[PDB]
Amino acid sequence: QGQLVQSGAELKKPGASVKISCKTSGYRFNFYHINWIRQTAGRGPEWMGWISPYSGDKNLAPAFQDRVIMTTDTEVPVTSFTSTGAAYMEIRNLKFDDTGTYFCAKGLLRDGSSTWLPYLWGQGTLLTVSSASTKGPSVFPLAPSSKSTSGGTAALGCLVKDYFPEPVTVSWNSGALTSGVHTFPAVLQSSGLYSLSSVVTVPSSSLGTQTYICNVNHKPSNTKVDKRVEPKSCDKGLEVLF
Amino acid sequence: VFLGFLGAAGSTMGAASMTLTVQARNLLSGTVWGIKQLQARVLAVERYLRDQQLLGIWGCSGKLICCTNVPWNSSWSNRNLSEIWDNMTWLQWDKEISNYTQIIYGLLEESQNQQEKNEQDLL
Amino acid sequence: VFLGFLGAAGSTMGAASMTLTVQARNLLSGTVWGIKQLQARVLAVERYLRDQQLLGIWGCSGKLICCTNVPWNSSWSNRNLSEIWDNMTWLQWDKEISNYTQIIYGLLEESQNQQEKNEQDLL
Amino acid sequence: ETFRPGGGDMRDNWRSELYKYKVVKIEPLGVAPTRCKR
Amino acid sequence: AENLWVTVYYGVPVWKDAETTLFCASDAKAYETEKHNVWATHACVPTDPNPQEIHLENVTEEFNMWKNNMVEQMHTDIISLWDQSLKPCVKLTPLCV
Amino acid sequence: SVLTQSASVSGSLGQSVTISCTGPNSVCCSHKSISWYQWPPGRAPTLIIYEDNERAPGISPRFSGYKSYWSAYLTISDLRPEDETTYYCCSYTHNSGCVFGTGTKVSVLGQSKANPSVTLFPPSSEELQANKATLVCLISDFYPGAVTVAWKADSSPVKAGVETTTPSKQSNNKYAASSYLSLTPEQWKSHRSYSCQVTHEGSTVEKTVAPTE
Amino acid sequence: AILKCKDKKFNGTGPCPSVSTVQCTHGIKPVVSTQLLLNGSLAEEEVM
Numbered sequence: 001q002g003q004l005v006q007s008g009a010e011l012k013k014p015g016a017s018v019k020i021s022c023k024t025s026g027y028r029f030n031f032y033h034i035n036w037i038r039q040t041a042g043r044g045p046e047w048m049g050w051i052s053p054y055s056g057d058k059n060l061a062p063a064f065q066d067r068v069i070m071t072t073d074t075e076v077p078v079t080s081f082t083s084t085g086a087a088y089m090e091i092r093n094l095k096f097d098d099t100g101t102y103f104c105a106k107g108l109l110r111d112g113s114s115t116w117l118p119y120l121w122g123q124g125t126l127l128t129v130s131s132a133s134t135k136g137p138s139v140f141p142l143a144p145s146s147k148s149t150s151g152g153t154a155a156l157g158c159l160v161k162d163y164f165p166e167p168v169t170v171s172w173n174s175g176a177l178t179s180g181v182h183t184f185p186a187v188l189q190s191s192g193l194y195s196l197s198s199v200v201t202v203p204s205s206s207l208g209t210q211t212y213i214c215n216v217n218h219k220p221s222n223t224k225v226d227k228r229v230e231p232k233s234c235d236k237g238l239e240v241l242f
Numbered sequence: 243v244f245l246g247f248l249g250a251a252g253s254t255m256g257a258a259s260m261t262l263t264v265q266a267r268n269l270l271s272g273t274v275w276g277i278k279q280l281q282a283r284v285l286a287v288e289r290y291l292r293d294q295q296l297l298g299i300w301g302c303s304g305k306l307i308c309c310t311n312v313p314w315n316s317s318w319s320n321r322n323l324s325e326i327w328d329n330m331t332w333l334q335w336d337k338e339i340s341n342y343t344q345i346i347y348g349l350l351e352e353s354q355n356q357q358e359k360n361e362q363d364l365l
Numbered sequence: 366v367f368l369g370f371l372g373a374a375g376s377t378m379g380a381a382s383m384t385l386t387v388q389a390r391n392l393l394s395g396t397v398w399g400i401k402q403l404q405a406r407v408l409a410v411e412r413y414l415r416d417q418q419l420l421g422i423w424g425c426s427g428k429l430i431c432c433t434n435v436p437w438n439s440s441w442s443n444r445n446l447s448e449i450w451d452n453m454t455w456l457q458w459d460k461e462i463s464n465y466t467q468i469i470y471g472l473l474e475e476s477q478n479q480q481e482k483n484e485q486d487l488l
Numbered sequence: 489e490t491f492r493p494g495g496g497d498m499r500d501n502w503r504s505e506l507y508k509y510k511v512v513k514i515e516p517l518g519v520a521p522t523r524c525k526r
Numbered sequence: 527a528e529n530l531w532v533t534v535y536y537g538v539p540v541w542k543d544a545e546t547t548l549f550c551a552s553d554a555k556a557y558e559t560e561k562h563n564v565w566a567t568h569a570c571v572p573t574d575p576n577p578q579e580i581h582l583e584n585v586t587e588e589f590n591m592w593k594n595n596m597v598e599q600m601h602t603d604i605i606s607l608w609d610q611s612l613k614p615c616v617k618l619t620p621l622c623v
Numbered sequence: 624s625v626l627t628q629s630a631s632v633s634g635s636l637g638q639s640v641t642i643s644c645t646g647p648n649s650v651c652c653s654h655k656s657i658s659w660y661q662w663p664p665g666r667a668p669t670l671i672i673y674e675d676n677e678r679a680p681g682i683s684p685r686f687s688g689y690k691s692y693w694s695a696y697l698t699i700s701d702l703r704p705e706d707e708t709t710y711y712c713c714s715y716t717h718n719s720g721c722v723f724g725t726g727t728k729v730s731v732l733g734q735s736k737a738n739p740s741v742t743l744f745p746p747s748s749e750e751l752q753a754n755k756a757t758l759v760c761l762i763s764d765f766y767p768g769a770v771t772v773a774w775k776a777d778s779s780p781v782k783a784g785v786e787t788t789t790p791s792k793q794s795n796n797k798y799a800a801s802s803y804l805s806l807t808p809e810q811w812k813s814h815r816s817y818s819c820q821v822t823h824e825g826s827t828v829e830k831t832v833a834p835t836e
Numbered sequence: 837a838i839l840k841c842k843d844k845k846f847n848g849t850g851p852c853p854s855v856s857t858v859q860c861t862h863g864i865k866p867v868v869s870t871q872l873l874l875n876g877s878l879a880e881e882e883v884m
């Protein structure tokens with residue numbers, strides 16, 4: 001009945017360390033356990049361990065018995081029933097097969113046999129373990145095209161090409177234009193660089209009544225790009241409507 | 243594990259119910275300024291006979307725990323057995339059921355008033 | 366039909382016995398002039414523990430209704446079952462049995478004192 | 489910012505010893521469900 | 527079984543904020559201080575040598591020192607401690623000469 | 624993994640369907656409880672069932688659990704279109720941890736077809752000054768999720784620079800994918816047009832842009 | 837009952853993490869003073 005948030009997606013070279021966080025709000029942090037579960041594409045979903053803030057007890061899996069440390073900050077009260085806290089995990093000696101998504105999960109109960117069962121979940125911090133360096137994206141504005149002549153509709157967007165590593169979050173008008181947007185999954189090129197595409201469906205009557213700006217945020221490179229998609233299209237099936 | 247008076251206030255309702263006899267043992271406890279205590283130790287026993295009279299006119303009389311033939315309505319915060327007795331505290335619970343406490347108190351004393359008259363028939 | 370406190374005072378004893386829980390719910394109810402109420406709300410609970418102690422030393426304890434193994438004497442106004450419970454009121458009744466109330470009160474607390482000692486034998 | 493000494497109201501002197509105390513009433517009658525019936 | 531029934535529990539850890547008439551306690555060597563009742567302690571109740579203290583784990587309750595009634599009951603008690611100690615004392619009415 | 628589920632299972636709308644979850648006795652099921660999670664790929668899962676047969680808070684009563692001494696099952700009566708995802712089980716106790724399973728991709732049969740909504744984009748003018756060229760072929764709103772994308776350079780098949788992404792499920796209970804073609808700034812000004820075929824259930828769909836126009 | 841907050845840093849207002857319950861408060865000498873607080877409880881760690 002709360003909310004869990006995780007740190008930004010970071011990139012680490014193998015052999016090094018990484019410390020991913022998980023802060024909580026909307027319940028009592030010391031009454032529930034915090035599991036950690038990871039999912040790579042070569043090993044399926046895999047539980048790692050849990051930890052109890054009130055007691056500090058930990059239980060670790062034999063595979064992660066010897067390379068993960070779990071740590072929990074102290075409880076900061078907010079109300080008589082709700083609080084605010086924090087949970088870290090630190091995995092040493094990274095490997096290629098460690099590339100995947102990592103989650104944090106509030107427990108289910110306080111007493112019983114299903115106490116530590118992961119009930120509430122976070123959002124996930126994708127961990128990429130590669131020797132390659134980080135690359136910034138190249139955002140190209142997609143020229144609008146004709147989707148319906150009789151319906152008076154269309155579709156423009158932005159082309160995020162060549163970036164590393166995942167992910168890339170694309171917004172529009174600082175979070176104002178949210179309907180009709182379709183963001184497609186990236187592709188893994190033979191060079192190892194991803195590249196996704198974003199396109200939003202808008203009517204043909206909207207020209208000098210609204211400003212179109214796509215916001216590509218790529219936090220690993222510390223670069224944000226804001227492109228102005230031109231509402232003048234080139235499709236010959238849509239030029240009949242203007 | 244005698245935690246003490248109100249020792250299980252953050253413990254689950256299931257966990258706290260083992261202390262029910264530890265909270266009720268210390269519930270009664272055995273010129274001016276000397277009347278500060280008289281008018282207050284009088285208010286300490288009317289608080290007792292107000293609670294005990296509810297326990298009397300229900301199907302309880304005998305103390306601590308006691309069932310009733312009142313079906314629990316789903317609109318009184320529909321939790322489950324493992325969501326109440328293993329994941330909630332008595333303070334947290336009486337917060338959701340503070341609206342319905344007065345509604346419920348009536349049924350117990352009326353469902354019991356039907357049982358006693360029926361008891362006199364079958365004697 | 367919740368007629369209210371003493372709502373069935375003219376109703377027959379049979380009719381009034383459905384209200385027994387409505388007369389006993391409001392029987393306890395939860396510088397000078399401020400002592401007018403103190404010496405009077407003290408007299409309000411001694412009146413309660415005087416009645417409850419009779420209910421305790423009889424075979425009642427638990428409230429409202431309760432039987433006894435005392436045979437009813439014919440000289441205590443020999444009415445019939447349909448002459449009392451269908452044609453008389455509690456006020457009208459305790460007027461004929463006001464002479465014998467003290468006589469009767471003894472047997473209940475003595476017939477019960479024989480039952481408990483016999484109960485300890487058979488345990 | 490400047491600060492100067494004060495007092496006058498004597499209800500402040502007690503608070504410096506009663507900051508960590510408060511008063512509650514015990515309500516021992518709580519209802520809750522379970523699969524029992526008489 | 528699957529349908530649930532209400533149950534009464536007497537003696538639960540359930541409290542709400544309220545105010546009641548508070549009284550005093552003051553050791554027993556303080557009563558040996560005597561000297562014709564110094565300050566307040568007379569028929570006041572002596573403190574038992576048991577000082578009971580129970581840590582309520584997991585509990586978190588919101589205090590408020592600036593809205594606390596133990597103050598208003600302590601201030602006005604000390605106010606009336608003053609006057610009760612001066613009622614049977616010598617009155618200086620003829621000392622305005 | 625040491626805990627095995629059914630590889631796949633099908634079911635029609637308005638009906639029921641069952642999933643298996645078994646393995647050796649070291650993990651299941653004597654003196655071992657079972658859980659069930661609805662886990663869409665990319666998103667975060669949702670607890671459906673715990674302690675073998677008990678639903679989670681708020682879970683609709685259309686799920687139910689049943690465990691034996693060798694296997695445990697889950698029946699999703701009244702199937703919804705948003706149920707076509709992956710489901711995992713776990714074998715836990717009060718003390719130890721979770722031993723997950725292999726996964727059951729549930730395909731909900733008896734649904735309506737969806738024709739793909741494809742839109743091909745030519746390389747931008749800023750990319751022709753770099754100079755490069757990338758054809759962006761986006762497929763949207765098709766069911767089931769399995770299309771094939773073939774490229775052609777002036778009505779002749781292409782085998783170089785072709786790449787198409789996996790069919791991914793959207794939030795409107797349809798699937799989506801994307802295909803890209805990497806070409807040089809010379810093959811862009813030498814051929815008359817480029818195309819993007821999207822075969823789907825025998826019915827091939829195709830969109831063509833023209834550098835000459 | 838009376839609750840005693842038992843942490844070292846509390847500005848007297850808000851939630852208290854380590855709450856304990858008591859029957860009678862600590863010895864509180866009614867010192868009628870102004871400006872300078874006299875013979876009072878000492879604070880813990882940092883001055884409050």
Ligand SMILES: *[C@@H]1O[C@H](CO)[C@@H](O[C@@H]2O[C@H](CO)[C@@H](O[C@@H]3O[C@H](CO[C@H]4O[C@H](CO[C@H]5O[C@H](CO)[C@@H](O)[C@H](O)[C@@H]5O[C@H]5O[C@H](CO)[C@@H](O)[C@H](O)[C@@H]5O)[C@@H](O)[C@H](O[C@H]5O[C@H](CO)[C@@H](O)[C@H](O)[C@@H]5O)[C@@H]4O)[C@@H](O)[C@H](O[C@H]4O[C@H](CO)[C@@H](O)[C@H](O)[C@@H]4O[C@H]4O[C@H](CO)[C@@H](O)[C@H](O)[C@@H]4O[C@H]4O[C@H](CO)[C@@H](O)[C@H](O)[C@@H]4O)[C@@H]3O)[C@H](O)[C@H]2NC(C)=O)[C@H](O)[C@H]1NC(C)=O
Pocket residue numbers: 030031032033052053054055057058059060061062109110111112113114115116249250252253254257583584654716717718719720
């Ligand atoms: C304030 O708030 C707090 C939070 O809100 C609150 O805390 C919560 O309290 C509740 C209780 O009220 C807790 O709920 C219980 O938790 C119990 C503790 O769990 C035990 O397990 C861990 C982990 O054990 C693994 O890891 C360690 C390594 O660290 C190994 O040593 C172990 O062997 C084991 O590892 C194995 O497996 C791994 C593979 O995964 C391998 O890698 C490894 O090599 C091993 O093979 C222990 O470490 C714990 O120890 C701690 O506790 C002891 C005190 O007991 C301390 O001394 C110690 O220092 C640690 O602090 C701990 O022992 C659960 O056991 C418990 O579940 C039982 O109880 C419920 C009812 O309570 C039953 O319904 C349930 O069936 C369970 O019953 C079993 O256990 C009881 C108790 O012993 C037995 O009596 C019973 O018979 C049964 O045991 C038998 O049956 C089993 C049938 O399957 C069988 O399997 C058994 O083997 C046996 O035969 C319940 O979940 C909750 O977790 C707290 N924390 C929260 C909510 O965050 C606090 O109380 C509040 N306080 C107040 C005052 O309100």
Ligand SMILES: *[C@@H]1O[C@H](CO)[C@@H](O[C@@H]2O[C@H](CO)[C@@H](O)[C@H](O)[C@H]2NC(C)=O)[C@H](O)[C@H]1NC(C)=O
Pocket residue numbers: 875876
């Ligand atoms: C004045 O302050 C001193 C602090 O040094 C108090 O002396 C301490 O009193 C406490 C208990 O009252 C003891 O635990 C300490 O050991 C004492 N300190 C030393 C150095 O012995 C003294 O009691 C205070 N006087 C008052 C408040 O009247």
Ligand SMILES: *[C@@H]1O[C@H](CO)[C@@H](O)[C@H](O)[C@H]1NC(C)=O
Pocket residue numbers: 315316317
């Ligand atoms: C249960 O509560 C609802 C209100 O949410 C009420 O309408 C209904 O009558 C209640 N049940 C009974 C048996 O009175």
Ligand SMILES: *[C@@H]1O[C@H](CO)[C@@H](O)[C@H](O)[C@H]1NC(C)=O
Pocket residue numbers: 337338339341
């Ligand atoms: C109790 O009722 C009040 C209004 O009377 C409402 O604001 C509150 O939400 C209710 N409490 C719960 C727990 O539903």
Ligand SMILES: *[C@@H]1O[C@H](CO)[C@@H](O)[C@H](O)[C@H]1NC(C)=O
Pocket residue numbers: 438439440
């Ligand atoms: C019944 O009452 C009469 C008086 O009218 C009395 O003599 C008699 O002894 C009583 N019965 C018993 C059993 O005492």
Ligand SMILES: *[C@@H]1O[C@H](CO)[C@@H](O)[C@H](O)[C@H]1NC(C)=O
Pocket residue numbers: 460461462464
């Ligand atoms: C009760 O006794 C008195 C005398 O003590 C007598 O006058 C009266 O008639 C008696 N009452 C009844 C109802 O017989």
Ligand SMILES: *[C@@H]1O[C@H](CO)[C@@H](O)[C@H](O)[C@H]1NC(C)=O
Pocket residue numbers: 322323324676677678679680
């Ligand atoms: C409540 O718990 C029981 C336990 O037997 C379970 O069968 C039932 O499905 C649960 N109900 C809900 C709504 O979770």
